[PDB]
Amino acid sequence: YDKPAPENRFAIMPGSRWDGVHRSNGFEEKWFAKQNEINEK
Amino acid sequence: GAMGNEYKDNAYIYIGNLNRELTEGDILTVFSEYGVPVDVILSRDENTGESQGFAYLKYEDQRSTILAVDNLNGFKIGGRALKIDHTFYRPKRSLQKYYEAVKEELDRDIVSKNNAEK
């Protein structure tokens, strides 16, 4: 299946040092959020 | 990619177009998720110092550097676009414990497989 668009492969988990501040780099990030946000299956 | 040398944990990236007030803590937080470094180096003018204009941090993984690069590449922060690029300079040399690294001490037990398969 042809992917819709390229994205990050290595999903490195965040650390406490990240302070938890908002850090964005691409709107595509919404895709990752959708995968994590699943309440129906 | 540096064949015959294969450098070890020597992953470094150049960071430019950063805020003047930007401190080490801010840099760590920004890159923290994108591969938090184990050390941050900030250039300073011995003549006066204060300002930097250049900074370099060591990444745990050389592959993780791709994330921050493609992520913070052209990314706007504080009205300034970040400029990420691969470095080529080497860290302060230290000839001490590395002495034991002399000669092929391990090298898969001097190439256990030897020359190809029997």
CA B59 to chain centre: 5
- The secondary structure element, H or E, covering residue A35 is helix A29-36
Task: Look up the domain containing B103 and give its range.
Answer: 1-118
Question: B100: helix, coil or strand?
Answer: helix
User: Are A25 and B36 within 8 A, CB to CB?
Assistant: no
Question: B42: helix, coil or strand?
Answer: strand
Long-range contacts of B1-9 (CB under 8 A, 24+ apart): B9/B58, B9/B60, B9/B62
Location of structure tokens 């840099």: B27
User: Are A26 and B64 within 8 A, CB to CB?
Assistant: no
Method: NMR
Cβ contacts from A onto B, under 8 A: 38
B30 in Cβ contact with B72 (< 8 Å): yes
Taking alpha carbons only, the member of B34, B89, B21 closest to residue B56 is B89
User: Are B29 and A17 within 8 A, CB to CB?
Assistant: yes
Q: What count of other Cβ atoms lies within 10 Å of the Cβ of residue A21?
A: 10
Q: Report the number of distinct structural domains present in chain B.
A: 1
Q: CB-based contacts of B81: which residues, under 8 Å, 6+ apart? A: B17, B74, B75
Q: CB-based contacts of A3: which residues, under 8 Å, 6+ apart? A: none
Per the structure block, which two tokens stand in for B72? Answer: 């913070």
